[PDB]
Amino acid sequence: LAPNDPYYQQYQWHLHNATGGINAPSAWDVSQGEGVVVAVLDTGILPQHPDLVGNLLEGYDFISDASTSRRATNDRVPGAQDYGDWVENDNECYTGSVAEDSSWHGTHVAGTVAEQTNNGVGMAGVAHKAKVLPVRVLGKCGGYLSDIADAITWASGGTVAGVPANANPAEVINMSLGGSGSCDGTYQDAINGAISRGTTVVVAAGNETDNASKYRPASCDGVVTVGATRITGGITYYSNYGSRVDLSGPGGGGSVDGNPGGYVWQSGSDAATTPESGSYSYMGMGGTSMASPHVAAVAALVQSALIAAGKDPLAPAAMRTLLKETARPFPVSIPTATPIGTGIVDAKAALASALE
Ligand SMILES: [Ca+2]
């Protein structure tokens, strides 16, 4: 499939480039992810973005700190509206942090997952007939572990005290987020719970050019940990690495690869603070955050394909095995000391193998 989205051809190398893309055109001949729900645990969403409308569920906001959520209270609430995660001043977050504009990360990630495709608008998305369940866990200066852990439980269809039952438990959770520290019990238990419900958990390796083993949830057991490659198909300058990294997706190499080839391009906003300060747009961003959802979306294409052919969905371990075994080996050598998994997720190869 060569969709008619106006910016797809020039911008979305991560979907269709022969060395650095994930082989989406071919995959899309088989599956677009219809009937599957992917929970995006992130900054929230811009639910009326015209290139996302129709592929979103209401979702929920798990941030239990008014100052982080930018909401009026510490309650968790239905919906996942991103209030904006800007930080106005250096050091507000921790010793040495730099002021930044709102990321709209969750809207960008949600785009990679299921941006409306072949709709004559904007960009394309990978599992563009799936639905995104946005689960807002990140706000100003990031998020709280306890919020993220409950979000995992709920997204996967487990019970959380004080939140209504999730009517739409997700086949796949994407966590484009990370922080220092080997995985704990709190994190590990939530993740184990999701796995036990049949949910594949896909996470970003992190962007510290360091060993993923030192970060969470990258270093958690049972997850698909995703490194980042460039348009060249080689490791990005920032990607984390090490034996925990299962495979890579296109994360974008940044400025060395220029514009557009250095960045992953999806739905977002140019708003510097509140949604209202800007307008709907398409943003180029680079990170293991951008790599993860390519992999998460491929998982969704696979589940969808199976369910369509009467087949059973893969269990989490089988999904990870399939994703790793079918990854395209890197077209540029990866240094021995910085392994980033078996290859670059290959949407078509994953599908072919699952449907054998
Ligand atoms: Ca579109």
User: How far is residue 171's CA from residue 194's CA, in Å, rounded to a whole number?
Assistant: 9
Q: Which of 176, 289, 292, 304 is catalytic?
A: 289
**Planar angle of CA 68, 72, 77, nearest 5 degrees:** 80
C-alpha torsion 128→133→135→141, nearest 10: 10
Reply yes or no on whether 270 is catalytic: no
Amino acid at 147: D
Task: Write down the residue that tokens 């998982």 correspond to.
Answer: 299
Q: Given the DSSP bridges, would you call strands 264-269 and 280-285 parallel, antiparallel or unpaired?
A: antiparallel
Q: Which of 14, 42, 61, 85 is catalytic?
A: 42
Reply yes or no on whether 105 is catalytic: yes
Reply yes or no on whether 103 is catalytic: no
**Binding site for Ca(2+): what residues are annotated?**
5, 51, 116, 119, 121, 123
Reported as half-sphere exposure (CB side, CA atoms, 13 A), residue 213 has a value of 6
The method recorded for this entry reads: X-ray
User: How far is residue 153's CA from residue 181's CA, in Å, rounded to a whole number?
Assistant: 21
Q: 8-354 maps to which CATH number?
A: 3.40.50.200
Find out whether 173 and 191 touch, Cβ atoms under 8 Å. Answer: no
Tally Cβ neighbours within 10 Å of residue 72.
Answer: 8
22: which 2 tokens? 């994930």
Find out whether 31 and 1 touch, Cβ atoms under 8 Å. Answer: no
In the chain, what's the furthest Cα-to-Cα distance?
54
Tell me, in angstroms, the distance from the centre of ligand 1 to residue 265's CA.
Answer: 11
**Binding site: what residues are annotated?**
5, 51, 116, 119, 121, 123
Q: Residues preceding discontinuities in the chain at C–N > 2.5 Å?
A: none
Tell me, in angstroms, the distance from the centre of ligand 1 to residue 279's CA.
Answer: 16
Tell me, in angstroms, the distance from the centre of ligand 1 to residue 4's CA.
Answer: 8
Tell me, in angstroms, the distance from the centre of ligand 1 to residue 65's CA.
Answer: 34
Report CA torsion sign: 247, 250, 251, 257: positive
Burial 314-335 (b: 16+ CB within 10 A, else e): bebeebbebbbebbbebeeebe
Find out whether 109 and 118 touch, Cβ atoms under 8 Å. Answer: no
Amino acid at 61: D
User: How far is residue 277's CA from residue 265's CA, in Å, rounded to a whole number?
Assistant: 21
Tally Cβ neighbours within 10 Å of residue 352.
Answer: 15
Find out whether 50 and 104 touch, Cβ atoms under 8 Å. Answer: no
Tell me, in angstroms, the distance from the centre of ligand 1 to residue 111's CA.
Answer: 9
**Planar angle of CA 6, 7, 10, nearest 5 degrees:** 120
3-state secondary structure the chain: CCCCCCCHHHHCHHHHCCCCCCCHHHHCCCCCCCCCEEEEEECCECCCCCCCCCCECCCEECCCCHHHHCCCCCCCEECCECCCCCECCCCCCCCCCCCECCCCHHHHHHHHHHCCCCCCCCCCCCCCCCEEEEEECCECCECCHHHHHHHHHHHCCCCCCCCCCCCCCCCEEEECCCEECCCCHHHHHHHHHHHHCCCEEEEECCCCCCEHHHEECCCCCCCEEEEEECCCCCECCCCCECCCCCEEEECCCCHHHCCCCCCEEEEEECCCCCHHHCCEEEEEECCHHHHHHHHHHHHHHHHHHHHHCCCCCCCHHHHHHHHHHCCECCCCCCCCCCCCCCCECCHHHHHHHHCC
Q: Which of 105, 108, 128, 294 is catalytic?
A: 105
